[PDB]
Amino acid sequence: KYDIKDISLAPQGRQRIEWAAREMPVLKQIRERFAQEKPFAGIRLVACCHVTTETANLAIALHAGGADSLLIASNPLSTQDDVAACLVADYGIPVYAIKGEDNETYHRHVQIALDHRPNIIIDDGSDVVATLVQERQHQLSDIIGTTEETTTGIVRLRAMFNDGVLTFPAMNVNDADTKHFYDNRYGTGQSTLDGIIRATNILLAGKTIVVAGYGWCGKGVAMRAKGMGADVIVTEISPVPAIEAAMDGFRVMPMAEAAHQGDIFITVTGNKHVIRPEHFAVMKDGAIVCNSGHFDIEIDLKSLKEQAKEVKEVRNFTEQYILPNGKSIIVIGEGRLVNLAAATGHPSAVMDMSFANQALACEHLVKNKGQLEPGMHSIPVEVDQEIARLKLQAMGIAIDSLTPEQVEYINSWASGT
């Protein structure tokens, strides 16, 4: 069966899935090869992803490859109910995902997914893989391998490995070049600001925007905030990215110093409680806080709730916390991934590459069944490079190639002066 909001939304989901496919040409080619080669024939698969038009196109590709797939939501607020309905009604793919579902429903959906007895698990944040290892030790004989879509998930997998419980292959999709160089940076840079603006309609120009973290996501958010006319502050914990942010023209300072100055705060660290009650207490009246890291725990909303004398919903996706002194803190999307909670996530152009990696990583797991060491594996270089070749070609961009003499010069070392 399935567990969705409204199956009558399927026609609208189909229209939007097909619209998104227009900028997923790499995944389309993979789908067309999968439909002939059937790499997943006889394989059961669980996907824990954001239920978007882009994930739909991925599920359609795995289905064309023969996968017996079950899809559940990676986050209660990111689900697109029309997409869920189209996958069920048009493709017969079980989806357990309702926008705005409560925590008990999420956890029940994880339990249903694990009862599918998957041979492959595609995860986004590593919730299902962690539950599998914790609660389903008897099922590990089913697992051919897993994949992980996002940075937070890769961190949890390293913790599982160092703890000694990562006893199967896990594909590091997030760290492929054609994943986090584009998705994490250019995707999050546009879609994060998109979610902020759809929720608040705020003018970004002239605002001070504090970006916590200057990794791939932070670089993208800061770059686009700057492009929209914001004054950008960056916080960090490591010196190499801090120097980069300064040489990119941004102010770098500790969060305790930024807290007095920011009009908008955006967390993209992967870590817990980056924005804290001692920061809330000194923020400007009306400061906006939101999160684009995988988990809402980057903002200590539990503490905010007890500092505040009152909380009100003042717009879709927008809560106003009023403190005893009468100042307000605005929270978007209850601290959930603001690009997916208040908008539609990354454009399909970058998910084409992220989800091409997902599809080919699953294929890599199956074709190497019984042959991979336990632990984390990076995406093979030749796969990563081929995705980039196909994407560049699909964008209509042509580049150069070395001549035979240029190749010879590379291998000569006596040639200098």
Add this chain to the structure above:
Amino acid sequence: KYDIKDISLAPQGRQRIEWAAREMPVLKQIRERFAQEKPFAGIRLVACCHVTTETANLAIALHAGGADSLLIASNPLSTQDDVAACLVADYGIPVYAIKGEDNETYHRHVQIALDHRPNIIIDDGSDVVATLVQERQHQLSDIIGTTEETTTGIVRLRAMFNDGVLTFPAMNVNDADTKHFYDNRYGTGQSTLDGIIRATNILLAGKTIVVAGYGWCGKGVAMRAKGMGADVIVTEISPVPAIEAAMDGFRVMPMAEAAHQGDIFITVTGNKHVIRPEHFAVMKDGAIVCNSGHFDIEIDLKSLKEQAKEVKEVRNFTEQYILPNGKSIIVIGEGRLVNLAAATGHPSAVMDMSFANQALACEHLVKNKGQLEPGMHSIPVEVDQEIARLKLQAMGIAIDSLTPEQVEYINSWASGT
């Protein structure tokens, strides 16, 4: 002895060396530790570097550490004669380097350097190390290790390794994070445009500027060309950087298509004959070509000379090649590293980090004498990270550090939802 232009220039060199030191605080701390610990006592050292105020401060640091050093020019056009004179007259460091010296003088200087019988060779482009391996097999028992400053040199060292002749440790200074993330990118981005403008006084705004290569240097040049108002075209041979350039807002195309459009061409590829006679023949009348890769071979100037009916020097560092149809091609700095030939190279702020790596790499070689495998070694992570910590501190920038609970969250994998 020494071989320099004019030792009466020493006072001016000293003034300029001390000016440059103001933004080399990391190297100063290393120098002050070196002067007490004397890591290089009894060690002979050859440096093949650009003879600039920044290299001078490096040589002063090695001298304080006890090194018996001899300095020669990495390039005939990059030498600063006042610096050469100050090093000889004020520090007693033999310098063999005359701005504008001919090719025979360069090669004689290399021979003199190798007769110093160095135990350590600091190289920039790998000319001296290649000559050592080619011509001085009997001297290899002297070598404790070598270092290489630039990307072109790292490529030659890989070729030496694959050929089986890299029989000693070579430190990869260029690829340290605190080297090519800053020097290669932000340094070249500013200093390349600096050299173009000092040579030509051209307005960059409104010009089409073709950047060949989108590695660390190409990213920097394109970013600053854009910042100065230029329309930027990027050429490449690999899809991952080509997609980056497009998502950074630049036009990507093959050089044969760019050749018709560019007002200024800048090569930063590391490869041979990237700009070719078939490109010259279709360039706009008055197009400017220059090179910021280590070797002038990136532009096929030999072919340009035979296509042209006439060449004239029309300004300092500036040659006009007139073709039979009357169109002109402008070449800056005879195709040598335009930032160092027509200006003063990178700012000392980034060379602080590059040359801190050089100093600590030499120390690493000495303290591990007889203990390192032959071949290339990367800069130890703890060294690289400490340089970044000290530089950030010296720039007056403070950042955050994780709390104990944040560290615990990193190592928990069961914590999701």
Add this chain to the structure above:
Amino acid sequence: KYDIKDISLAPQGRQRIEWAAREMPVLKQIRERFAQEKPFAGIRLVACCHVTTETANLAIALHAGGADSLLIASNPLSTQDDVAACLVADYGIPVYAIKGEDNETYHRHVQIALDHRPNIIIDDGSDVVATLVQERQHQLSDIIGTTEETTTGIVRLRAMFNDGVLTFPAMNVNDADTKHFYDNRYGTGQSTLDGIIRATNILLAGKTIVVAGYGWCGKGVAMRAKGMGADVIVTEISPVPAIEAAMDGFRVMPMAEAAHQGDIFITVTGNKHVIRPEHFAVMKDGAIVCNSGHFDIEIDLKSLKEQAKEVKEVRNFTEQYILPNGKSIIVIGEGRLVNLAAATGHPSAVMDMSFANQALACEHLVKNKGQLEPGMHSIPVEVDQEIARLKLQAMGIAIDSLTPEQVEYINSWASGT
């Protein structure tokens, strides 16, 4: 009476009106004074504006001042039905505005508005003023004066004046410094991209975006498109803005050349048939065209409809036209101003200044009745400057002030050598 979609939407409208007011502090101050001084007591007023949360705050300020106002939509597609419901239900202000109303309904609303016998007309695009002068010459004795919000309307007023029929005072709100320096530039720059992204979810980075016109709006749209990673082409008819665009780093060319290259076309010229059938014929398959000028006539959609062999809606606000050769053209918002048709228009921060100018322009007409010549009048400098001073204060920015010594220097001509 009134003519709206659904009065039950009033609670949501009220909430959204209050949210927008958070960044309209200058208009709030004006409303509070109007509440005390009642400058519009006994005055009947018609407003033809986009029926948005920002217009609602203006209407509430006019209401506080005693104006007997009637509001109609400036564009069938920009109306926010929840705003219309709140103005009727909560303030008792007659609104004639239904999102998506047909042309006959819009025209009927204009007739009903003129039947209100306004003393003041606030117009956005000059439709109501033109209908008054063409059809209601017998009502001109009612008119104290009118105001005009946008550049297209000013051009119409100019033609009326040159035609001898602008026989009453008309305030040029659009050309106030605190209107078109911010609204037209920074507001359109952000909200045009907002509309495009809400409609299509497209990644802007790496796309070629053609901006027709490099006036206040074109400068903002090109600036923000570039900030979002686009490759930007600008078209023009006048050399001064064309040179500016080039020195701002954009590619300038005739539309016939741009037509082959653009992925997205945005018209902001104020002129008719800037994109024509001969341009559609050479566009890439799937090129997107939209308009941010006041009237959709900037794109020759009538010819596109005749050219095309079929048209279908492929997403909300998004139509696909298929040409007889099978290539497709995507049109957003039926060519109506894409920021208001597919999103929510400008942020309230800039509309604060635009509509402060509207409020004080209406006050100016009433306070100076019988002392203003017929024809166009600019916003008094003292008013324009006070709006800027108050907005800068409300943004929390402090600046310097001239000293007596500096004033003396300005008035001194003999000094300086």
Add this chain to the structure above:
Amino acid sequence: KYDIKDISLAPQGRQRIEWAAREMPVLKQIRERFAQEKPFAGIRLVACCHVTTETANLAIALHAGGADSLLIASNPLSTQDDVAACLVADYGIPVYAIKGEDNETYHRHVQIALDHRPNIIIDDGSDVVATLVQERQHQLSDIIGTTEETTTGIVRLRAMFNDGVLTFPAMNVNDADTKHFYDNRYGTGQSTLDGIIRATNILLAGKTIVVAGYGWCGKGVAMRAKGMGADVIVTEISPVPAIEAAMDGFRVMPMAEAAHQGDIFITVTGNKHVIRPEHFAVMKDGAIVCNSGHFDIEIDLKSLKEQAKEVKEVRNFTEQYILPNGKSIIVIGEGRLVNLAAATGHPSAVMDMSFANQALACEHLVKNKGQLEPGMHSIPVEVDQEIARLKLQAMGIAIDSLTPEQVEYINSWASGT
């Protein structure tokens, strides 16, 4: 006679003058017409300009037109001695200009220039016109008219007019669209940074740069500082440019707040004592201060000299002031316009338009002698626009032209619904 440093520099001057002419095609066209029509036959002319390769091309165009010209320096530090030598030796044009001349020599040169009894005075900063009106009332019958190149001079002319002593026509060259939209913005933006970098070699990326003034010059300097990776602070006295700076992404604050934060200070206000002792007192150790306004009086250097306990030159164009508390302030170019004092001023591409305006303004004064009122006159629109059309053509850029149908639409007011 003449008064120059060294006539033997003429060959180098000639070469550099010819090089600069490559991007002065509009002035070349004007010179060629002047050579034919001789508009200045019998006219005596004085030019007080920066003695640069660009001014030389203007002087050559006036010479071609028959003008009996005499040229003196506009600033003791901007003079290019090789240019002065070429104008004397090759063209026989009297030049009174020595780079680094003292104040008494500058004043003597102004007296010699007025002794030429000019009919036309071209001024840059209005010193010669002010000296004429103060000291040479008996010569006013000589004057056909004057021109003024820069914003400071316009302000002086305004004060003269308000004082009743501007009794002849004076052409406002600075405020022509093709002058201050490009020269003041794009030229100053690039050449100010050029001067700073030539003097100091400092890395701009990661520095905090304070720009005083957000007019045409301030907009350009802030834009290019940001493009080079700086963190940019803007100071102002008027709210309209202050809001613009904020929405352009810069931090706006009073100079007293900026004084603690800046690494580099750049004054472009046109006003006196913008940086004062109370600012020097709180600057970072080693802060750099420079001026790109016409007169050095924007920085209170006289007070700094009194405050300081010592001063020394630490590099070409670079002085270190040491305060009694041991902190140091670095001054570039003795506070004289840093683009011309430490580099070569604007690129010839923008001076092409500025000096085309100068040439045609002088022609306008002669052709309209006896028909111009005393007081200031703007450049005729037709002249301003033709300069733009010719420059855009010479840049190789093509744009569109209105059709008959579009013209009809502009003049139609009844249409649009």
